[PDB]
């Protein structure tokens, strides 16, 4: 099913 | 948490102080949800503690005391035979001395006006008035019950009526002296009270 | 985990275990239709020990109705509490055997005996490891001490590792039923003193005693009668379903009580007792519950401990108190009745404490005994047998179906040999 | 809005409906008076006492939703779970039990979501088990 | 790099490491989650970002504890599978523990400290706890002791072993799982010290004024000294003494290595209302013959060894005046073949204690190890109850029908005998 | 239960 | 009783 998309690189 | 989770004074604790750092947050980085050290609560109303003639006083008035909660009612004969010793325990530590070292809480399970009255006039310390909706979110809050009435969640009774509890500054529960619990001394640990440690603050 | 299979024999057992599922379920949090309430983590984290999940949410107990009588059954189905049990594990009798050993054993001992041990197996093997095999009957009746004995048989020659009880009630020294007792009992402790691991002796009388004396009932029933020996039935596994300061077994008793391994007959009490003048101004303290479990009053068994000497005492706390007056409270009832005691093994007594009180009560204790007061009724059986052979009557019916001679005099020279074996260690 | 109710005693609080920030929220599928609930509904209130309220930040976070046949029905058994619910007259109630594929035996369930709404985990009671969520992974910025 | 492990088996190890590890959570500020709102690198590893993981294996064959304390609000604290549980319990039977039903799971518990033990390099001792009246504290206990000791032979096995009381008992094969034990127990741990009953249990009659505490209040009277031990290792001290130079001072002869324990002060508010707490009243009340852990009463024995432990603002001025007042006192016997038999020590940390406890807070402690030739008399009462057993062949008949075979209780009981021979001739 | 923490007091 | 405590003794 649809499943939530990880968080992006928090851009260190 | 402290003592329990599912109680009513938790509830509105959180509730209030979540909103109090979401609006400073909304106003303005923090860190959700906030902590228990930075959940402050301001315990006890404005109209629920009274003394002897019945003059209502603020909370503010409790710094520097041993505050404790006393969890009984006029019928049952445990609290009977414990008043007079508890009577003579508030005596004497509290004549004795040159601060006023210890202060006692009273709530109440008399079954209708009268008979919460009854047991005040043989009882000088503070107590709060069974009209108002503060003495059953104490109830539950340090989980006292004569018998299962209120559906509890998931907690046994660690305490029967009577009952006698040192709190902190938060609402905390300091240490239950063991009149009635899993071990049932009577008429004796009320010594146990240590008035450095326990400090409204 | 592990898990007790119960076997449920006799008409008399049939009606006692009944009691049992009535008084575990509903302190466990079982409504008869099987769901459960009581919003309780303790009542659930080990509920598997007597039931089996059925994946519709319900518990079935791990129960064997057996027995030759059809009536015995269909009131345990019309009962309370009558709709637990799988119809599968019943087996049912219609030929009856009628309060005899003999038939009970061999004739219709054999047609049941291949259906009731199929239906073991598949509540045995469906587990993972199973523990011990608990089994309500009475040596007094034809079907519940012949072809519940069989069951006794067959169970250990298939599984001779397991630990296994009975709870079994006794012939009558005083008013007595059922005419061949000694018939029924002695032919039967044969085989409970070589294949089986512990033996718990009930009298109906001495549970007459409890109701008349320590109860001041009027005109009890079976409904109490059963329920104060299954108090104490509860009590004696209650503490492997529930956790505790110091946790106990079956196994753990019985390594610790049984010293010999021919002798395994306990002593089974309970406290605390109360009737409406007994509950009001009484104290619940553990040093008052100290004197009821050493009380002849407070006994479920027949035999009197002051004429006899304890071997190997122990007791099964509930509740909220301190494991230490558990044990000097078992230190001075040792250092006063020392002459009550065995002098040979220090510190007879063993004390277990569970964490789970009886519901609604505070504190409640199961008192288990190996003791030399026992061989009172073993004697009682023991020459009412010898009256009913020095002139041959009543067996002729047990020769009509192949119980002969032989077995019958050995019979009493392994019974003189059991009390000759207990009274040589006093 | 005011469709999901921190409870309280004497008067039940609207929670505030960003309470869920940096929690794992899980949906709670059950029916009062069903068999298997009823032994499911205390130890998944006791992963609830433990896990959250042993450190001062909360990790978990419980979301009721009634499948029962009464409103006083729901009323007893949403003042003994000790998580947030949803009303019983909300529009919430019957819009998650029809987008989740959960029929009115094989409930109950959990399923843990994400903060953008849609399913993240699923796992039943159908049969240690409760112990395979964890409350590290749906962590809401 | 130098860490320690500590070993619970039994129920009663369980219970007394649930109030050590409370009380070691509360004295370092990690958190019952395990994350802390470089001391504690001795206790716990660094599992991630902020986790403080304990380092332990909890045995026990019976699994209603085990499974109790995963249950319990410090589920997440440890690792869940060196909570191994065994299927039923050995049921106080030292044979069963040992043979039968120890097998599947010592594996799993030797192949576990393995994986433990290589997280650091260069590691000291165990923290080995256990009931000896027990069967499954005794056999599955003294079965792991052999296998450490094959295995890993330059450690420092320290045993805590709970010795049964004369007149307490709680069961009645314990003359049989303690006396078979110590055959098995002797030669392979280094460091043992006895805590019976009935000592503890007056100890906290009369100094804490309370007539009932329970299980657990005595365990937390044990957790002090549990954690006073190792706090030298934990936190920094004026003179630091750590586990392995107990081989080096406290043990004179490598056979004798069973030592008595001492905690002072152990009071509560009324006693904390009334007296100052200074290290000459200290000393005096840890030698106080009835503060012993294990009913020991010193006046007919004759001490060779000893190791005090202060803590708090203890200054070396006046420690060295506090032991000069005990080697002058008379009613104190020192060995004639040492001349000083003293060796203090100090940290700078003051004890920590459990909120809602027993005990009041004090600024000063010390707990006290010390080697007496009074300890026969521990062992003379057990002499005396195994063979009043053994005299009608007593209980062996299931010892028998699992592997405890005649003879082996027959050796044990000479060398408990050489035990008892052992501490004359030392005394001489 | 759970326990608080003792106060780490600064710089004693 | 709690007895009052007396003055305490003014001296130079
Ligand atoms: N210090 C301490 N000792 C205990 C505790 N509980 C039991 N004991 C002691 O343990 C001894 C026997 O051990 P058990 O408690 O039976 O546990 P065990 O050694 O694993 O033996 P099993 O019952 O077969 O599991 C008893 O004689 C008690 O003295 C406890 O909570 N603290
Ligand atoms: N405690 C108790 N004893 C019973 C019960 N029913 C019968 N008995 C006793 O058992 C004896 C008769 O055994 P019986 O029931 O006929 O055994 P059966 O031959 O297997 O049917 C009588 O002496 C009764 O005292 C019962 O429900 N409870
Ligand atoms: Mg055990």
């Given at each position: 099913?649809?499943?939530?998309?990880?968080?992006?690189?928090?851009?260190? | 948490?402290?003592?329990?989770?599912?109680?009513?004074?938790?509830?509105?604790?959180?509730?209030?102080?979540?909103?109090?750092?979401?609006?400073?947050?909304?106003?303005?980085?923090?860190?959700?949800?906030?902590?228990?050290?930075?959940?402050?609560?301001?315990?006890?109303?404005?109209?629920?503690?009274?003394?002897?003639?019945?003059?209502?006083?603020?909370?503010?008035?409790?710094?520097?005391?041993?505050?404790?909660?006393?969890?009984?009612?006029?019928?049952?004969?445990?609290?009977?035979?414990?008043?007079?010793?508890?009577?003579?325990?508030?005596?004497?530590?509290?004549?004795?001395?040159?601060?006023?070292?210890?202060?006692?809480?009273?709530?109440?399970?008399?079954?209708?006006?009268?008979?919460?009255?009854?047991?005040?006039?043989?009882?000088?310390?503070?107590?709060?008035?069974?009209?108002?909706?503060?003495?059953?979110?104490?109830?539950?809050?340090?989980?006292?019950?004569?018998?299962?009435?209120?559906?509890?969640?998931?907690?046994?009774?660690?305490?029967?009526?009577?009952?006698?509890?040192?709190?902190?500054?938060?609402?905390?529960?300091?240490?239950?002296?063991?009149?009635?619990?899993?071990?049932?001394?009577?008429?004796?640990?009320?010594?146990?009270?240590?008035?450095?440690?326990?400090?409204?603050? | 985990?592990?898990?007790?299979?119960?076997?449920?024999?006799?008409?008399?057992?049939?009606?006692?275990?009944?009691?049992?599922?009535?008084?575990?379920?509903?302190?466990?949090?079982?409504?008869?239709?099987?769901?459960?309430?009581?919003?309780?983590?303790?009542?659930?984290?080990?509920?598997?020990?007597?039931?089996?999940?059925?994946?519709?949410?319900?518990?079935?107990?791990?129960?064997?109705?057996?027995?030759?009588?059809?009536?015995?059954?269909?009131?345990?189905?019309?009962?309370?509490?009558?709709?637990?049990?799988?119809?599968?594990?019943?087996?049912?009798?219609?030929?009856?055997?009628?309060?005899?050993?003999?038939?009970?054993?061999?004739?219709?001992?054999?047609?049941?005996?291949?259906?009731?041990?199929?239906?073991?197996?598949?509540?045995?093997?469906?587990?993972?490891?199973?523990?011990?095999?608990?089994?309500?009957?009475?040596?007094?009746?034809?079907?519940?001490?012949?072809?519940?004995?069989?069951?006794?048989?067959?169970?250990?020659?298939?599984?001779?590792?397991?630990?296994?009880?009975?709870?079994?009630?006794?012939?009558?020294?005083?008013?007595?039923?059922?005419?061949?007792?000694?018939?029924?009992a002695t032919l039967s402790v044969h085989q409970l003193v070589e294949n089986?691991?512990?033996?718990?002796?009930?009298?109906?009388?001495?549970?007459?005693?409890?109701?008349?004396?320590?109860?001041?009932?009027?005109?009890?029933?079976?409904?109490?009668?059963?329920?104060?020996?299954?108090?104490?039935?509860?009590?004696?596994?209650?503490?492997?379903?529930?956790?505790?300061?110091?946790?106990?077994?079956?196994?753990?008793?019985?390594?610790?009580?049984?010293?010999?391994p021919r002798l395994?007959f306990?002593?089974?009490?309970?406290?605390?007792?109360?009737?409406?003048?007994?509950?009001?101004?009484?104290?619940?303290?553990?040093?008052?519950?100290?004197?009821?479990?050493?009380?002849?009053?407070?006994?479920?068994?027949?035999?009197?401990?002051?004429?006899?000497?304890?071997?190997?005492?122990?007791?099964?706390?509930?509740?909220?108190?301190?494991?230490?007056?558990?044990?000097?409270?078992?230190?001075?009832?040792?250092?006063?009745?020392?002459?009550?005691?065995?002098?040979?093994?220090?510190?007879?007594?063993?004390?277990?404490?569970?964490?789970?009180?009886?519901?609604?009560?505070?504190?409640?204790?199961?008192?288990?005994?190996?003791?030399?007061?026992?061989?009172?009724?073993f004697?009682?059986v023991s020459?009412?047998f010898?009256?009913?052979?020095?002139?041959?009557?009543?067996?002729?019916?047990?020769?009509?179906?192949?119980?002969?001679?032989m077995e019958f005099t050995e019979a009493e020279s392994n019974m003189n040999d059991l009390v000759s074996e207990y009274?040589?260690?006093? | 809005?005011?469709?999901?109710?921190?409870?309280?005693?004497?008067?039940?609080?609207?929670?505030?409906?960003?309470?869920?920030?940096?929690?794992?929220?899980?949906?709670?599928?059950?029916?009062?008076?069903?068999?298997?609930?009823?032994?499911?509904?205390?130890?998944?209130?006791?992963?609830?006492?433990?896990?959250?309220?042993?450190?001062?930040?909360?990790?978990?976070?419980?979301?009721?939703?009634?499948?029962?046949?009464?409103?006083?029905?729901?009323?007893?058994?949403?003042?003994?779970?000790?998580?947030?619910?949803?009303?019983?007259?909300?529009?919430?109630?019957?819009?998650?039990?029809?987008?989740?594929?959960?029929?009115?035996?094989?409930?109950?369930?959990?399923?843990?979501?994400?903060?953008?709404?849609?399913?993240?985990?699923?796992?039943?009671?159908?049969?240690?088990?409760?112990?395979?969520?964890?409350?590290?992974?749906?962590?809401?910025? | 790099?130098?860490?320690?492990?500590?070993?619970?088996?039994?129920?009663?190890?369980?219970?007394?490491?649930?109030?050590?590890?409370?009380?070691?959570?509360?004295?370092?500020?990690?958190?019952?989650?395990?994350?802390?709102?470089?001391?504690?690198?001795?206790?716990?590893?660094?599992?991630?970002?902020?986790?403080?993981?304990?380092?332990?294996?909890?045995?026990?064959?019976?699994?209603?504890?085990?499974?109790?304390?995963?249950?319990?609000?410090?589920?997440?604290?440890?690792?869940?599978?060196?909570?191994?549980?065994?299927?039923?319990?050995?049921?106080?039977?030292?044979?069963?523990?040992?043979?039968?039903?120890?097998?599947?799971?010592?594996?799993?518990?030797?192949?576990?400290?393995?994986?433990?033990?290589?997280?650091?390099?260069?590691?000291?001792?165990?923290?080995?706890?256990?009931?000896?009246?027990?069967?499954?504290?005794?056999?599955?206990?003294?079965?792991?002791?052999?296998?450490?000791?094959?295995?890993?032979?330059?450690?420092?096995?320290?045993?805590?072993?709970?010795?049964?009381?004369?007149?307490?008992?709680?069961?009645?094969?314990?003359?049989?799982?303690?006396?078979?034990?110590?055959?098995?127990?002797?030669?392979?741990?280094?460091?043992?010290?006895?805590?019976?009953?009935?000592?503890?249990?007056?100890?906290?009659?009369?100094?804490?004024?309370?007539?009932?505490?329970?299980?657990?209040?005595?365990?937390?009277?044990?957790?002090?000294?549990?954690?006073?031990?190792?706090?030298?290792?934990?936190?920094?001290?004026?003179?630091?003494?750590?586990?392995?130079?107990?081989?080096?001072?406290?043990?004179?002869?490598?056979?004798?290595?069973?030592?008595?324990?001492?905690?002072?002060?152990?009071?509560?508010?009324?006693?904390?209302?009334?007296?100052?707490?200074?290290?000459?009243?200290?000393?005096?009340?840890?030698?106080?013959?009835?503060?012993?852990?294990?009913?020991?009463?010193?006046?007919?024995?004759?001490?060779?060894?000893?190791?005090?432990?202060?803590?708090?603002?203890?200054?070396?001025?006046?420690?060295?005046?506090?032991?000069?007042?005990?080697?002058?006192?008379?009613?104190?016997?020192?060995?004639?073949?040492?001349?000083?038999?003293?060796?203090?020590?100090?940290?700078?940390?003051?004890?920590?204690?459990?909120?809602?406890?027993?005990?009041?807070?004090?600024?000063?402690?010390?707990?006290?190890?010390?080697?007496?030739?009074?300890?026969?008399?521990?062992?003379?009462?057990?002499?005396?109850?195994?063979?009043?057993?053994?005299?009608?062949?007593?209980?062996?008949?299931?010892?028998?029908?699992?592997?405890?075979?005649?003879?082996?209780?027959?050796?044990?009981?000479?060398?408990?005998?050489?035990?008892?021979?052992?501490?004359?001739?030392?005394?001489?």
């Open positions: 099913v649809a499943k939530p998309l990880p968080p992006p690189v928090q851009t260190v | 948490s402290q003592p329990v989770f599912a109680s009513p004074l938790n509830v509105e604790k959180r509730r209030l102080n979540e909103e109090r750092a979401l609006m400073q947050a909304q106003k303005a980085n923090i860190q959700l949800p906030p902590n228990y050290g930075d959940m402050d609560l301001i315990l006890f109303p404005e109209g629920s503690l009274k003394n002897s003639n019945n003059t209502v006083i603020p909370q503010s008035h409790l710094k520097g005391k041993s505050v404790a909660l006393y969890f009984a009612d006029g019928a049952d004969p445990k609290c009977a035979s414990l008043l007079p010793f508890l009577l003579n325990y508030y005596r004497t530590m509290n004549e004795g001395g040159a601060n006023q070292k210890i202060e006692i809480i009273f709530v109440s399970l008399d079954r209708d006006r009268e008979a919460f009255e009854s047991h005040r006039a043989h009882m000088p310390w503070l107590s709060i008035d069974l009209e108002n909706p503060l003495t059953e979110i104490l109830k539950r809050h340090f989980r006292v019950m004569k018998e299962y009435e209120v559906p509890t969640y998931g907690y046994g009774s660690r305490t029967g009526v009577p009952s006698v509890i040192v709190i902190g500054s938060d609402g905390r529960e300091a240490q239950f002296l063991p009149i009635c619990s899993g071990l049932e001394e009577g008429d004796r640990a009320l010594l146990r009270w240590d008035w450095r440690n326990t400090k409204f603050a | 985990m592990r898990e007790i299979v119960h076997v449920q024999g006799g008409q008399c057992g049939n009606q006692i275990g009944a009691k049992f599922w009535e008084v575990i379920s509903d302190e466990h949090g079982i409504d008869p239709t099987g769901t459960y309430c009581g919003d309780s983590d303790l009542q659930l984290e080990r509920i598997n020990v007597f039931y089996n999940e059925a994946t519709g949410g319900r518990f079935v107990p791990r129960a064997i109705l057996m027995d030759l009588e059809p009536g015995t059954m269909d009131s345990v189905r019309a009962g309370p509490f009558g709709q637990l049990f799988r119809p599968d594990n019943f087996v049912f009798g219609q030929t009856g055997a009628g309060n005899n050993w003999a038939k009970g054993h061999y004739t219709e001992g054999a047609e049941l005996i291949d259906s009731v041990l199929d239906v073991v197996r598949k509540e045995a093997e469906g587990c993972d490891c199973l523990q011990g095999f608990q089994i309500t009957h009475s040596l007094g009746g034809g079907t519940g001490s012949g072809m519940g004995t069989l069951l006794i048989s067959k169970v250990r020659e298939e599984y001779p590792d397991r630990i296994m009880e009975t709870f079994s009630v006794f012939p009558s020294p005083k008013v007595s039923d059922t005419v061949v007792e000694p018939y029924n089986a691991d512990e033996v718990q002796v009930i009298d109906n009388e001495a549970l007459y005693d409890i109701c008349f004396r320590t109860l001041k009932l009027t005109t009890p029933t079976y409904g109490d009668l059963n329920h104060l020996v299954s108090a104490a039935m509860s009590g004696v596994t209650c503490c492997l379903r529930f956790p505790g300061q110091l946790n106990s077994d079956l196994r753990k008793l019985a390594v610790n009580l049984i010293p010999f395994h306990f002593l089974i009490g309970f406290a605390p007792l109360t009737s409406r003048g007994s509950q009001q101004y009484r104290a619940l303290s553990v040093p008052e519950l100290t004197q009821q479990m050493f009380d002849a009053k407070n006994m479920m068994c027949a035999s009197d401990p002051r004429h006899g000497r304890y071997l190997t005492a122990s007791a099964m706390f509930r509740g909220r108190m301190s494991t230490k007056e558990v044990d000097e409270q078992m230190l001075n009832v040792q250092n006063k009745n020392s002459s009550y005691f065995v002098e040979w093994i220090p510190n007879n007594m063993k004390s277990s404490v569970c964490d789970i009180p009886p519901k609604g009560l505070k504190m409640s204790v199961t008192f288990v005994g190996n003791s030399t007061a026992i061989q009172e009724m004697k009682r020459d009412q010898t009256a009913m052979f020095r002139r041959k009557a009543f067996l002729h019916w047990y020769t009509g179906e192949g119980m002969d001679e009274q040589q260690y006093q | 809005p005011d469709v999901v109710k921190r409870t309280q005693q004497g008067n039940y609080v609207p929670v505030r409906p960003d309470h869920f920030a940096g929690v794992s929220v899980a949906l709670f599928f059950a029916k009062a008076g069903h068999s298997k609930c009823a032994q499911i509904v205390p130890v998944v209130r006791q992963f609830y006492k433990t896990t959250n309220f042993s450190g001062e930040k909360a990790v978990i976070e419980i979301i009721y939703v009634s499948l029962d046949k009464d409103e006083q029905d729901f009323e007893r058994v949403r003042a003994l779970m000790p998580w947030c619910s949803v009303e019983y007259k909300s529009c919430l109630r019957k819009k998650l039990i029809e987008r989740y594929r959960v029929p009115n035996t094989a409930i109950p369930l959990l399923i843990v979501i994400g903060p953008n709404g849609e399913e993240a985990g699923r796992m039943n009671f159908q049969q240690f088990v409760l112990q395979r969520w964890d409350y590290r992974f749906n962590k809401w910025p | 790099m130098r860490e320690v492990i500590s070993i619970h088996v039994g129920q009663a190890g369980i219970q007394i490491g649930n109030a050590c590890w409370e009380l070691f959570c509360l004295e370092h500020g990690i958190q019952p989650d395990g994350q802390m709102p470089d001391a504690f690198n001795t206790f716990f590893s660094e599992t991630g970002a902020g986790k403080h993981v304990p380092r332990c294996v909890f045995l026990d064959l019976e699994p209603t504890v085990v499974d109790e304390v995963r249950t319990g609000t410090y589920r997440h604290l440890f690792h869940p599978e060196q909570l191994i549980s065994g299927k039923e319990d050995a049921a106080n039977n030292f044979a069963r523990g040992h043979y039968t039903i120890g097998k599947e799971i010592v594996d799993l518990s030797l192949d576990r400290i393995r994986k433990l033990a290589d997280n650091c390099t260069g590691l000291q001792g165990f923290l080995m706890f256990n009931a000896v009246g027990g069967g499954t504290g005794s056999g599955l206990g003294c079965l792991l002791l052999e296998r450490l000791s094959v295995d890993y032979g330059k450690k420092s096995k320290l045993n805590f072993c709970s010795w049964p009381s004369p007149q307490v008992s709680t069961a009645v094969v314990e003359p049989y799982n303690s006396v078979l034990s110590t055959h098995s127990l002797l030669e392979h741990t280094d460091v043992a010290v006895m805590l019976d009953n009935e000592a503890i249990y007056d100890i906290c009659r009369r100094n804490l004024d309370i007539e009932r505490p329970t299980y657990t209040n005595l365990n937390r009277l044990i957790a002090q000294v549990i954690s006073s031990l190792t706090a030298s290792l934990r936190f920094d001290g004026a003179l630091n003494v750590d586990v392995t130079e107990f081989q080096t001072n406290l043990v004179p002869y490598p056979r004798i290595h069973f030592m008595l324990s001492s905690y002072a002060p152990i009071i509560s508010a009324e006693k904390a209302y009334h007296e100052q707490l200074s290290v000459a009243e200290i000393t005096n009340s840890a030698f106080e013959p009835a503060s012993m852990m294990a009913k020991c009463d010193p006046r007919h024995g004759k001490y060779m060894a000893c190791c005090l432990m202060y803590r708090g603002d203890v200054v070396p001025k006046d420690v060295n005046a506090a032991v000069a007042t005990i080697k002058t006192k008379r009613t104190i016997q020192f060995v004639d073949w040492c001349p000083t038999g003293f060796k203090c020590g100090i940290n700078y940390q003051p004890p920590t204690v459990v909120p809602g406890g027993d005990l009041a807070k004090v600024m000063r402690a010390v707990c006290m190890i010390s080697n007496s030739t009074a300890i026969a008399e521990v062992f003379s009462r057990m002499d005396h109850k195994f063979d009043l057993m053994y005299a009608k062949r007593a209980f062996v008949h299931w010892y028998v029908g699992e592997g405890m075979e005649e003879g082996e209780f027959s050796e044990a009981r000479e060398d408990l005998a050489a035990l008892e021979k052992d501490y004359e001739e030392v005394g001489i």
